């Protein structure tokens, strides 16, 4: 006789998909839309290399911890990598005012240019080279943060300082300074003669007045004293004004923000790989066309969408048996 039949494709594929009513359905064709692989490295992001603070933190970096000299002058970065628990932070115990806000600002910056706004040589009637501690040691000798200067008395006298700086630049300035909180009145007089002191700082926007708190505290890094740091952003053509009769950790270097942009502060224990990528996560870089990944929520660059699934397979062909 003669016959015609109608039928459908079948092949040797073992690619299963899931539906709402049935799991593990073997089908002919299926596309995977979920990327599950990274390279386990910290790579450049489109040619521009990350800033990898190793055992230094942002505070140690910006203030100039003597153990952080690797990052004395830092080129443009794509993103910053800090460890969960950096060992080189504030060598001299104390605190950093609005620290998290500053880190947040850093997520918006790609390049700093460190400039000298006040030379150490410009301190006529005070000692600018004796402000060092064994808690901030450099090569087994007492040092201190490099970008700020711990001013002490000269010839048993601390004359009131009035110093102003006009931001002649067109970039915004990150300006850092500090106050010293001694452990006792004896230390206060030993360091700055004057018993009762202050630091007043003013801009167009800022108007603050710090007073040292002299008190016994538990020891941290062998010290009961503390340093408290502050920062501000000087607008172009605005000036910053300092007036102090003691306890003043003057600024020396400030930071020009020459490149605003989209950046991020990653917490990763990883170190620099020598690679490039378009998408980076704390655990490694991604090379994918896939629309989804399940590697890490925190991501930088042209990336797939993070999703909590370990399997997303979309059916293209028909049922197979």
């Amino acid at each position: 006789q003669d016959q015609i039949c109608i039928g459908y494709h079948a092949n040797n594929s073992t690619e299963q998909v899931d539906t709402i009513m049935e799991k593990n359905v073997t089908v002919t064709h299926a596309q995977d839309i979920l990327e599950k692989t990274h390279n386990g490295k910290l790579c450049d992001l489109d040619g521009v290399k990350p800033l990898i603070l190793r055992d230094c933190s942002v505070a140690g970096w910006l203030l100039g911890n003597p153990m952080c000299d690797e990052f004395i002058n830092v080129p443009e970065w794509s993103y910053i990598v800090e460890k969960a628990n950096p060992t080189n932070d504030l060598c001299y115990p104390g605190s950093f005012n609005d620290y998290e806000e500053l880190k947040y600002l850093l997520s918006r910056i790609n390049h700093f240019e460190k400039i000298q706004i006040i030379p150490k040589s410009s301190w006529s009637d005070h000692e600018a080279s004796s402000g060092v501690s064994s808690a901030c040691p450099y090569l087994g000798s007492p040092s201190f943060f490099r970008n700020v200067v711990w001013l002490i008395k000269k010839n048993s006298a601390y004359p009131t300082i009035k110093k102003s700086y006009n931001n002649t630049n067109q970039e915004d300035l990150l300006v850092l300074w500090g106050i010293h909180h001694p452990n006792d009145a004896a230390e206060q007089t030993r360091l700055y003669q004057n018993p009762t002191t202050y630091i007043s700082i003013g801009t167009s926007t800022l108007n603050q007045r710090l007073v040292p708190k002299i008190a016994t505290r538990s020891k941290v890094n062998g010290l009961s004293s503390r340093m408290e740091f502050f920062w501000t952003i000087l607008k172009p053509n605005d000036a910053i004004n300092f007036e102090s009769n003691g306890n003043f950790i003057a600024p020396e270097y400030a930071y020009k923000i020459v490149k605003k942009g989209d950046s991020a502060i990653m917490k990763s224990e990883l170190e620099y790989g020598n690679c490039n990528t378009k998408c980076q996560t704390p655990m490694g870089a991604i090379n994918s066309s896939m629309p989804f990944h399940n590697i890490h929520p925190l991501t930088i660059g042209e990336c797939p969408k993070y999703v909590k699934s370990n399997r997303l397979v979309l059916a293209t062909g028909l049922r197979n048996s």
Partner: protein, 164 residues
């Protein structure tokens, strides 16, 4: 088999068909063979290509995630941050997975539909001039060479061919 064609009245698939998803197998005087239906197969291709790119395109503005840090006395807003980012993560994970589950099913049954309607496209042509076997095959009462076959597989089967 929501439409009863695939794994329904048709007992399975043809390994031999390698040029499309749905097609015919003929057996005549001049020989036997397979031939995929370029029409329904093409429409199917546009169907799943468009579905795929629709699912991808619908979900490109998801939720990005930027790191924010909080001190020891900002525990409440740190918690708020954490719970909101995990929240969005969860609603989008749910969206992706769910959408896959739905459109997979709709896709399979779409194939089923294609096969059934192809079969009917023929059945409505070879009315009395052939008998329904029940397995998706038609037994001819007349004689159909490769030209009667080609004319079937393009919709132009001429029923004027008597019976009995």
């Amino acid at each position: 088999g929501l439409f009863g064609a695939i794994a329904g009245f048709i007992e399975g698939g043809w390994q031999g068909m390698v040029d499309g998803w749905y097609g015919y197998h003929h057996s005549n005087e001049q020989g036997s063979g397979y031939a995929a239906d370029k029409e329904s197969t093409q429409k199917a291709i546009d169907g799943v290509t468009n579905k795929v790119n629709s699912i991808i395109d619908k979900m490109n503005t998801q939720f990005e995630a930027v790191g924010r840090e909080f001190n020891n006395l900002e525990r409440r807003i740190e918690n708020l941050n954490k719970k909101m980012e995990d929240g969005f993560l969860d609603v989008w994970t749910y969206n992706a997975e769910l959408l896959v589950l739905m459109e997979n099913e709709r896709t399979l049954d779409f194939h089923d539909s294609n096969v059934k309607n192809l079969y009917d496209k023929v059945r409505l042509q070879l009315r009395d001039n052939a008998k329904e076997l029940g397995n998706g095959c038609f037994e001819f009462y007349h004689k159909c060479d490769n030209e009667c076959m080609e004319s079937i597989r393009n919709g132009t089967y001429n029923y004027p061919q008597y019976s009995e």
